[PDB]
Design a protein around this ligand. Structure first.
Ligand SMILES: COc1ccc(C(SC[C@H](N)C(=O)O)(c2ccccc2)c2ccccc2)cc1
Ligand SMILES: Nc1ncnc2c1ncn2[C@@H]1O[C@H](COP(=O)(O)OP(=O)(O)O)[C@@H](O)[C@H]1O
Ligand SMILES: [Mg+2]
Ligand code: NA
Length: 331
């Protein structure tokens, strides 16, 4: 029925990265939707949208997320995930950072990313849309095939969760004891994201290379009740997953390895797709050849130092455009 959207976002050169040449190794064409990489010998790859080095946070949100957020409110499950080498901007893009000195409020911090922006807009868009709705969110991170709850307000972070097949959902799982915090309004948001960021920091003291190796699944489930002209009970449920994947360069890497075998299985149209053999592919089975509306943001470097992963990343992301999903709304 419908193709997975792939986008590419390149970041500006960082402090480590030397640029020798007068003209770029990575050129992004937003109009032609082409990323062109100098291996005058090139490989040019077309994507669904492309975002060069100076693309700001608000544009990414505007171009990619605003459209998807509308599908969430109709009650499609969506899933945006970020993919690419450590240091290209998967966390910058999906979470963002906090500007120093309290120069800006969270709502207006231009370093803010998809997660906080989205949560903010869910409340603006639904408050003046007439709907009866609630928002409850959760923050699960996978590391070494273990499940960490960063929003559980009480528990020690190293208390890890179990997963089991949802007896109500053919291609889904329930994460037992996962803290699903109800957000009653936008002013409850920051406090929740802070607690998430803090617990995360604690988990990093416990495990090696945690930032780069962890997958981070930040869900948000919109319950929307609506009365019909016929006097019925229209209860629709949007779910948006916002997934920050472990760095592409990596049992520690079982989930990332399996994500590859799944995508491979799907594109080459081989009958057995091994969702079941990793926690990530179990949690997101429905985002990959299922009934969810997936977008991948593939984050690349502009620089010669990281060309090899920049290109690995582009080939991996580009074959992912051939996956067909059959979106369905939850009532
Ligand atoms: C789980 O999703 C999150 C968590 C934390 C943040 C975030 S950015 C966190 C940063 N991505 C990180 O991993 O440390 C925040 C930072 C510090 C305190 C509280 C929040 C932020 C929120 C709104 C605006 C700007 C920055 C953003 C998204
Ligand atoms: N699009 C961007 N604009 C400005 N700075 C960026 C951008 N993407 C990444 N950076 C910076 O480069 C570093 C890498 O970001 P990070 O989100 O940790 O990457 P990842 O999560 O992909 O390992 C951070 O310091 C970040 O602020
Ligand atoms: Mg990161
Ligand atoms: Na264990």
């Amino acid at each position: 029925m419908k193709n997975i959207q792939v986008v590419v976002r390149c970041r500006p050169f960082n402090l480590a990265e030397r640029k020798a040449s007068a003209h770029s190794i990575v050129e992004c064409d937003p109009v032609r939707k082409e990323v062109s990489v100098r291996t005058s010998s090139r490989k040019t790859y077309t994507f669904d949208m492309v975002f060069g080095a100076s693309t700001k946070q608000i544009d990414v949100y505007r171009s990619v997320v605003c459209p998807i957020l509308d599908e969430v409110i109709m009650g499609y499950n969506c899933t945006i995930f970020a993919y690419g080498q450590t240091g290209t901007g998967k966390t910058f893009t999906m979470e963002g950072e906090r500007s120093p000195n309290e120069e800006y409020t969270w709502e207006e911090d231009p370093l803010a990313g998809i997660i906080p922006r989205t949560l903010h807009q869910i409340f603006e868009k639904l408050t003046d849309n007439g709907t009866e709705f609630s928002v409850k969110v959760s923050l699960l991170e996978i590391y070494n095939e273990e499940l960490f709850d960063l929003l559980n307000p009480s528990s020690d972070v190293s208390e890890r969760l179990q997963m089991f097949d949802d007896p109500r959902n053919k291609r889904g799982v329930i994460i037992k004891g996962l803290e699903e915090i109800t957000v009653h309004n936008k002013d409850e948001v920051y406090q929740i994201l802070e607690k998430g960021a803090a617990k995360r920091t604690t988990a990093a003291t416990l495990m090696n290379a945690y930032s780069s190796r962890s997958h981070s699944v930040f869900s948000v489930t919109i319950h929307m009740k609506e009365t019909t002209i016929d006097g019925e009970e229209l209860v629709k449920i949007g779910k948006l997953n916002l997934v920050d994947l472990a760095g592409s360069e990596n049992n520690i890497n079982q989930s990332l390895l399996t994500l590859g075998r799944v995508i491979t299985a799907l594109v080459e149209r081989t009958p057995h797709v091994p969702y079941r053999e990793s926690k990530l592919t179990r949690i997101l089975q429905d985002s990959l050849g299922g009934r969810t509306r997936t977008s991948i943001i593939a984050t690349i470097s502009p620089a010669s130092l990281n060309l090899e992963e920049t290109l690995s990343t582009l080939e991996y992301a580009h074959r992912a455009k051939n996956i067909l999903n059959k979106p369905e709304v939850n009532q």
